[PDB]
Design a protein around this nucleic acid. Structure first.
Lengths: 757, 769
DNA sequence: CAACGCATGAGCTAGATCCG
């Protein structure tokens, strides 16, 4: 058989050896195998337990802080291949800080598919250089075996194997003193092999029983199917974990196995391209029954589940299970007390909830002030009914003020009743604002909401405040409305205003939309006969001002005439930014750089526009080599009606210089004066990059030492060349070079000025 | 002028039209005067009228949201002198959130002695840039004309002339029908008429006749019987920095209004008494008082309002209250702190009291001297007490220090959710308002719900500080129900401060104790040598009644200990000379308490011999006490030295120091020391053989690569010799095997690697053949 | 039976009575 054993999940073992008993019959371990932090263990209990039927390892194997093992070949005698499906700490196999391991004993590995091996801090291992990872590890450039007992060649390293010649030495590669590393002829690289050199079936690996058979070798390459395995099995089975393919009847249960959210370590397995993949990627969503992923036309939502038909959310950690739940087949109850940073975390965990199919409870809810975080909720149909024929229930909402906006949202509901009691901040005209949208005036039913239980800490049960005038600026809005007077005008103490993203309210934001209304406050006459008012929920949106500068522009060159730019959008667009405007201008050369002798200490160191739209980069072309460019950035939001925008963002650029443009052109002319001073003339390269600053002349007699001369820019300018003093008669090999602002060019021919001896 | 009308006490204008014609018969105002919340009356109802019947007010002025006023000459068209002994906002004038006005009426007001000017938060207000603040009082830098809508000079302001004397802003003016009297800013506050100069000379505000000190309505020095002498001669006494009045006139000034009362004190016949001096109504002079003394404090009209955070009304020392008090302070988000800013010094309140927006305080302990309420003045609704918006108050006063009794006034317990009803019933009995059958309106549907006043403390049963963590355990706490225990919520945070708050603290929750076991907490990794403030609170189940049985352990400051120091940061050993090297570093990243010294070792590293023979042919220690530098000497040219460096914090009971750091650096080389020395002796022969004998360089200079022997001839090619170590050692220099005729010269320069030496003198030898 | 050894000390493996 190929794999006659049993499947085996990945586990973790720590502080004991009791949970290793569950490997009695399982052969292939998907996931990884980590055994760590085991201390009070004798070395003697390791010589009686064995696992002869373990072969396949998918992700990685990790041994860490083991006490008592001297040779792990007694524990893992028959594993051959490590798939390395998941790299662990950028490794596929790590043996670390082992205290007793005399020898490794891993004599059956043939091919590490992906990853590398790491052995560290093991002062007890030998034969570590007799492994020949190159024949097993397809990637040796990541091997890391340092600080072991073989740091010094002191542990023997004797063994009875061809003694391969992969390096320049006849290194003999053995695993232990009784086994060598098996190397057969390489006519097939990883196609399986026998002890007689007969290559087995092409699509399998490692040890083998009969050659050229895909049914009786050991480990194969791509997949596996019932004693056979082909590179791509037919699609009555869908590929699974890139090593198998199985009928959809198998893993469709696994989708239903943890559809009850008992463990978040699983995935809602989906079918996509004959891969029972955990999630079909972004731009794809799930249908109900077919388990195939829909192309997700436009933005689409994602799903999880609720808890036992009734899930209670106390804080964000309770709502963490409801992360990304779109449809909920049950009831829901929310009890939020408070915490830290309650601004947008509640809208992040459940800002994509689509539907709830039971009854909603807002009992004991105080930290909220509004239920606007069900932005995507559309319907509460409620198949199950709360006792008392209820489907909406709310008590003890001391600060709850706004249920939902019926201008920007449409609620619907079908059956059940409502309950609004002891919600003082919650008004009465607002709970009269849902029955037109929720439609409970239809299928007309007698709901039970008390007239007195709401309107406390406000006064709105009677009238509806009316605005009179609104006027919006870039940062402020005035709010003058119609004056409301109770029948006893002395009873009105004042007004209170709520706003969230006459009176002068000053703290606004450009291009931001707010919700505003006005609430009255009156006292109570000695009959329990209150008055009051609430204006309707009115949206106010600000206007557009000029944005800010484009943040942190950067500009790197990739050629002799190319600058590419990268910046950031301005912090406040203050409206839809249509485009950008970019100006670049040349900075020729710093003229004060002309007057320094550089061979003394070292180195001292309108306009065109481009309109880039809906982008954050720009490739500038047609530029001079090695010339500093100054770049101005405009982020302009509105263009057609007399465009306006921000202050320019300033950034500098330099083009990469050309290398050939610095060589001295032509032979360097020599002039011989009778007084042993010579005139060496050359012409400066016609297109310097920045500046040609120094000249390196090197006159040398063949067979004698060389003495360098620095020809300064001033000396070349004032004298046109170099007057080379102190020159004995005879022929000289003279090398001439011009040092520029970029680097060296090339030496000229050896300038031969010769006089016959 | 000349005070032609009668003197009147304070007044206030509210909510009506008929009462806007009263100051036409009052000339001197002694008391407060305010106009605010003008909502019942519409713009058209107001009337415009000018009357020269007002010359002085002795207290502050305030405007706040007046709807429908079109000119300020309607009530104050002759007001000349304003100064107050009782301040409000600390300013003599307060213009706040007023709207629907486009012109003023104070074209004569130019005397300001007491208080400053605050022009802030004024919407739709004009004529605030056609006023020379350097003319009305001291120049603009002492006045807060900010937060307004005339800081940018809004509205079109028309000043007559563009009569108006020589000066949005077109001229200084206050009304379309009246002009600001403008004169050089040198007068500053001396005031002036329309003459382009100080009114008379040293006047203050305005003068009836220019060039006469007698007719100064007020002057910068004290006025006495037609003069403005610098100080008041006896028996006259100083009177508000502008008058001299004798003791009889000092008494007669206030006896006439029988208002404000003036007493002789510090030669200042001013309306004041020193601290804790009550009143004796025989001459209304200051008389000594003991204990809680309300002394001088204006409570006329039997009521007083507080809508400011700072004012000179409840800080003078007026403990006993004979009037009413209403709190309407604008701005902020905690009236509990706003209330404390006004009544911090007063601990006994005999008048009207109420609290709103209780926060940052759970119990009241600032009213421990209140033990009697008079109620002689009737309170609004006969209620001397209101309770409302008490969402943070958990406990009331004790009944061994407060001992309040109410002789007139009624109770109001509404919207007190956090306070439990146990304290509420104690109020009714101690105050005895329910015991006087006086009607108390009590709302226990909104009170005694969501309440918690059980604040039992827990004590840390057993604690352990360690160098980086601290174990803490507290006694097993069981509320009245064993099931009613949701564990504990220990709050801790690093707090080397001895004044730290928990309202701004990492929280750990602890399982309920075994039903035992001591519930405790061990921190999981902390900075060594750090102080931590730790406390527990018991988390318990709350019933539908919301009755709290939890406990709250107190804050404990327990400090983790120190550990080994961190390495001396940035350890650099660089050469400063050929024979000395220096080591430099920085104090440890984690000093772990006081540093006692820096443990630093060093030693010499030599050069191996095979470097020389290559041709190309205990340990010394230092102790650095709280210093980041090390200098060592006695070193050799071009020699490497490794220097161990550590940092220590404690060395008396144990050697606890940072782990070692090593820097290996070499002293600078001596290039000149490679120069050839020693007698260059020649053995010249006639068979083209010359024996060369030059000596080794003066200094070893590290490895010596070779010896450069360059024997040359003038007219022939130059020949170089690479004298190896073996060659030099065996030949005592060099020998010339085969030569050419002529006087040869050889320059010798030994080649080492310590820099490069210099070519010695060319030693001539005449080769012959 | 009252620091250390049979880890390290906040870099996918626990979190300092975390283990005895």
């Amino acid at each position: 058989h190929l794999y006659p054993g049993e499947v085996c999940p990945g586990m973790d073992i720590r502080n004991n050896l009791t949970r290793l008993h569950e490997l009695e019959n399982c052969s292939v371990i998907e996931g990884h195998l980590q055994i760590l932090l085991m201390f009070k263990t004798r070395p003697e209990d390791f010589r009686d337990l064995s696992f002869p039927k373990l072969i396949m390892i998918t992700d990685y194997l990790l041994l860490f802080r083991v006490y008592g093992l001297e040779s792990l070949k007694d524990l893992f005698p028959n594993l051959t291949v490590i798939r390395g499906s998941r790299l662990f700490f950028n490794y596929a196999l790590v043996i670390f800080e082992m205290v007793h391991l005399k020898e490794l004993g891993l004599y059956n590995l043939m091919n590490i598919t992906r990853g590398s091996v790491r052995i560290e801090k093991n002062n007890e291992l030998c034969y570590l250089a007799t492994i020949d990872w190159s024949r097993i590890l397809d990637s040796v450039e990541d091997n890391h075996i340092v600080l072991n007992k073989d740091d010094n060649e002191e542990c023997g390293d004797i063994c009875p194997c061809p003694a391969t010649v992969i390096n320049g030495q006849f290194v003999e590669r053995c695993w232990t003193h009784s086994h060598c590393q098996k190397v057969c002829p390489t006519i097939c690289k990883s196609h399986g092999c026998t002890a007689e050199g007969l290559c087995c079936h092409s699509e399998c690996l490692g040890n083998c029983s009969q050659p050229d058979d895909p049914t009786k070798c050991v480990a194969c390459r791509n997949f596996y199917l019932d004693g056979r395995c082909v590179e791509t099995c037919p699609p009555p089975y869908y590929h699974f974990q890139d090593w198998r393919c199985v009928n959809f009847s198998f893993c469709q249960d696994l989708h239903h196995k943890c559809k009850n959210s008992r463990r978040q370590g699983c995935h809602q397995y989906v079918i996509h391209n004959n891969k029972c993949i955990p999630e079909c990627p972004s731009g794809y969503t799930m249908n109900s029954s077919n388990l195939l992923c829909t192309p997700c036309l436009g933005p689409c939502p994602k799903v999880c589940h609720l808890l036992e038909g009734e899930k209670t959310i106390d804080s964000v950690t309770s709502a963490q299970e409801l992360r990304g739940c779109t449809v909920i087949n049950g009831s829901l109850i929310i009890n939020i007390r408070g915490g830290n940073n309650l601004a947008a975390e509640l809208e992040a965990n459940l800002g994509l909830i689509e539907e709830i199919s039971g009854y909603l409870k807002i009992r004991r809810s105080y930290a909220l002030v509004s239920l606007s975080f069900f932005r995507k909720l559309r319907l509460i149909r409620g198949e199950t009914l709360e006792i008392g024929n209820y489907s909406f229930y709310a008590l003890d909402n001391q600060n709850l003020r706004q249920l939902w906006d019926w201008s920007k949202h449409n609620l619907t509901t079908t059956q059940g009743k409502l309950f609004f009691h002891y919600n003082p901040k919650l008004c009465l005209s607002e709970i009269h604002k849902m029955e037109e949208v929720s439609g409970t005036k239809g299928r007309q039913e007698r709901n039970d909401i008390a007239l007195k239980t709401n309107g406390d800490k406000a006064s709105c049960e009677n009238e509806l405040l009316k605005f009179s005038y609104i006027r919006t600026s870039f940062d402020k809005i005035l709010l003058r409305w119609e004056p409301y007077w109770p029948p006893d005008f002395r009873d009105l103490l004042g007004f209170m205003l709520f706003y969230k993203e006459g009176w002068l309210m000053r703290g606004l934001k450009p291009w931001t939309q707010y919700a505003i209304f006005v609430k009255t406050l009156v006292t109570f006459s000695d009959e329990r006969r209150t008055y009051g008012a609430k204006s309707d929920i009115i949206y106010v949106q600000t206007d557009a001002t000029n944005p800010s500068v484009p943040l942190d522009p950067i500009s790197v060159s990739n050629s002799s005439s190319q600058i590419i730019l990268k910046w950031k959008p301005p912090s406040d667009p203050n409206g839809n930014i249509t485009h950008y405007l970019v100006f670049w201008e040349r900075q020729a050369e710093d003229s004060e750089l002309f007057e320094l002798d550089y061979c003394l200490k070292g180195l001292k160191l309108h306009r065109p526009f481009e309109k880039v739209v809906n982008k954050e980069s720009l490739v500038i072309s047609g530029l001079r080599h090695f010339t500093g460019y100054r770049i101005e950035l405009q982020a302009c939001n509105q263009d057609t009606p007399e465009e306006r925008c921000s202050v320019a963002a300033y950034v500098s650029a330099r083009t990469m210089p050309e290398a050939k443009a610095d060589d001295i052109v032509g032979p360097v002319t020599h002039e011989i004066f009778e007084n042993n001073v010579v005139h060496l003339m050359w012409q400066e390269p016609k297109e310097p990059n920045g500046l040609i600053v120094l000249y390196e002349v090197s006159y040398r007699r063949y067979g004698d030492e060389e003495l360098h001369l620095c020809v300064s820019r001033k000396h070349f300018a004032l004298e046109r060349g170099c007057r080379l003093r102190g020159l004995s008669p005879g022929n000289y090999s003279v090398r001439i070079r011009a040092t520029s602002l970029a680097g060296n060019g090339s030496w000229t021919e050896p300038t031969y000025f010769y006089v016959t001896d």
